[PDB]
Ligand binder design. Sequence first.
Ligand SMILES: Nc1ncnc2c1ncn2[C@@H]1O[C@H](COP(=O)(O)OP(=O)(O)O)[C@@H](O)[C@H]1O
Ligand SMILES: Nc1ncnc2c1ncn2[C@@H]1O[C@H](COP(=O)(O)OP(=O)(O)O)[C@@H](O)[C@H]1O
Ligand SMILES: [Mg+2]
Ligand SMILES: [Mg+2]
Lengths: 371, 371, 56, 56
Amino acid sequence: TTALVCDNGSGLVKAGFAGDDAPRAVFPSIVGRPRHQGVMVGMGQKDSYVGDEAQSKRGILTLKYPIEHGIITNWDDMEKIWHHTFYNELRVAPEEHPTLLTEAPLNPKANREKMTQIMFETFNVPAMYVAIQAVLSLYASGRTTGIVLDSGDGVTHNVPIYEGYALPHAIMRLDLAGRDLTDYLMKILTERGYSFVTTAEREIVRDIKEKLCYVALDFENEMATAASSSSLEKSYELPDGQVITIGNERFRCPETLFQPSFIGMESAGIHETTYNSIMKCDIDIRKDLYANNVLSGGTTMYPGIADRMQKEITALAPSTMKIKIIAPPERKYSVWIGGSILASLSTFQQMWISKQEYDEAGPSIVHRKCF
Amino acid sequence: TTALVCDNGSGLVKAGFAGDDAPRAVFPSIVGRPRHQGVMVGMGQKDSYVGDEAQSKRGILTLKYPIEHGIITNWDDMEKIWHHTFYNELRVAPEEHPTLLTEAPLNPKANREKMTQIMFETFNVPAMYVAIQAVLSLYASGRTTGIVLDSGDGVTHNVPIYEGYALPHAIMRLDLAGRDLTDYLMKILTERGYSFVTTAEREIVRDIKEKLCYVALDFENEMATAASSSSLEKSYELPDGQVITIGNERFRCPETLFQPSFIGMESAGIHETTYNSIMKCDIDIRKDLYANNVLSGGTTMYPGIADRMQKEITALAPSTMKIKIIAPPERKYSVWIGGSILASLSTFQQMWISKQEYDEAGPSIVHRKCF
Amino acid sequence: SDKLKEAETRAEFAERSVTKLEKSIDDLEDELYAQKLKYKAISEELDHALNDMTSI
Amino acid sequence: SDKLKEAETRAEFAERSVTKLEKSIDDLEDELYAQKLKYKAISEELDHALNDMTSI
Ligand SMILES: Nc1ncnc2c1ncn2[C@@H]1O[C@H](COP(=O)(O)OP(=O)(O)O)[C@@H](O)[C@H]1O
Ligand SMILES: Nc1ncnc2c1ncn2[C@@H]1O[C@H](COP(=O)(O)OP(=O)(O)O)[C@@H](O)[C@H]1O
Ligand SMILES: [Mg+2]
Ligand SMILES: [Mg+2]
């Protein structure tokens, strides 16, 4: 039979059968209970709208993501999300399909063990396998080397790989991602008068960020230009009218990636953690990693980031090496495309964690040889 | 049929069919298992890369030479190296070709006996013969007398020969060679800030030594000049950029040959063990040995050694004798050229150790008349 | 609809132009690589002559 | 309206990319010119050496 390549993510759940080009169903991972009282009788009001249904009734819900930073903080809601994904968005019972979840690097063990225990006890799948979210993004590019920066919505991690041999001592995981950029944008919009507070209006700020923000090639020059002319002010129409005008908030929101001091984080930007991740590698594979830097994940879709990052790394790196940044147009679904490719391989067909194996060793089987 | 003139050496395996000018395939003798984990599936990752393949993937391997000082310390790896040499670099099955290995003087017997046992049982050659590495280097020069200093990469030995009669009581074998010079160079580079530790970076230090180091004609004057001017500082570009500048480390690394007290060895330099080897000979053949001093082996390729050695010996020797140092441009492959010449001789065709002879007397046949 | 057609046409031309420019820069980068190889080889040969002459 | 906004954004992205590519190709051409100048200088020095070696 065919395998189910699910990809929990944090912000958008992407799923679909193995062997295709794009995920079959992509929908936000939010579960929102209603918060008001409700007076109409017999309206058929449910107790929790999940997935894309709660992005249409969000006016009277309190949306809450069940995955904070890679890790899962609310297991009941995550189980609800998985149940919805299997039964309503794909309509395939899990009793007859292997599953291939994905997990960020350096995550707590208990999260992974609970994930496998749920998949084997509640949904009762035949066999499931958990894979690191960066190796798949490297599969999708058709490479076999390279250092991949997978800046998702929950957590940004940077896994270097050479000739198929991952370097476990050079993984640099940073917890700045799309969600913190949304919060920072929502916080700097208040400098013009627009106040978004409700958890429903966070979605509106996210839409503003997606449609308007861009990464500046040079930050100081843009700050000077936006403060003199008015060629940058782009307007946007809220879900009820009252258009708003975003000035130099456009390139200040995604600039947080390269200067995490804006949101008070100490660490260095995504332009310098990649160079540090390279320098921890051996001295003889640094040229190949320099030449095959891969971008993935949703948050790396800002217009103009593949040039800013290349300029920064070229500034840091030695002058002789060639710096090349692979930015495929299908960046958002790169992890899932790689997952489909991996699940479609014949050599991989014996790596699944078969159910009888789980019955013999318990949920701690995932840390064992079947990784 | 044609004979296979293999030459194990220590650092570079040189092989080729008898009767040519240069070895057909020359490649480092290193076998390196991968050391990291490896995440790509189906990449076709082997368990051990040998020969010149492991000098390209050395970034994720742990290279280890199977021959320490002439002697062989790891028989499985040496068997792997021989198998590679026969099947992939020459592509001739050994079942139809005699072989002519080479061995340093004064080596343990068990090494030679195991070598012949392997060649007769595993590879199943028709007949093999083991020859001393210095007599061949004397063949290649077209002489018949002379004292040859064969400073390889494993061990430096100094065999005097007159009129074809070797003098077994005058062989002076010293264990300082190219590898110790590489280690000493790697140890003195730390005085400027460059630290090479990994077994892969030993190859980089070896390349530095080959391309930059030279032997000073007079040591104290060079030490004084390099400490005042800056006309010696030559720069070199690492495999990733960050050029380095070698100062008076240039002529201090190969100076260890003439003053083995630098690396803590007690014995006298290669300039004085040759004179001692001569003085042990009879009083009537010392003039001929003085006039026909032969250099061979890789490590004697330093620019300016054929003058320093001549100056030193002229200082030691009596003033009347003429001191001449033969330094052919084809020094590195001198032993193998001599091996080809010896294997191509008709008079030598009945000295091979035929397989039926080995079957009758066991591996101890090599010490017998068929030397 | 008319404005959409115009903008799409100009964007398609821009894509074609950037493809042409990227190919041109690839060609010129390859040419610079070849000339860098030339300088490497000539400097290596000069060093070889220097070491041969200093070492006779 | 959605299609028009998409097309406009595509056009702006492509224009900025073409600007960057043009600047980069010009800079690399300058670098190649400089290295060619160095090669020609040392080549003229070697040609003078050959002119003197004609008397050698
Ligand atoms: N076109 C876009 N432009 C800018 N940001 C985007 C775009 N699309 C998605 N994002 C950001 O990326 C996030 C989605 O990232 P995604 O790759 O789905 O995360 P995950 O790894 O959890 O799947 C969204 O929250 C949004 O903030
Ligand atoms: N051109 C060179 N200049 C200086 N040293 C060299 C040069 N070529 C080789 N060497 C040294 O000689 C060694 C190779 O010696 P070789 O004659 O191959 O040893 P073997 O007797 O085992 O074959 C290398 O390890 C290197 O350190
Ligand atoms: Mg992701
Ligand atoms: Mg030798």
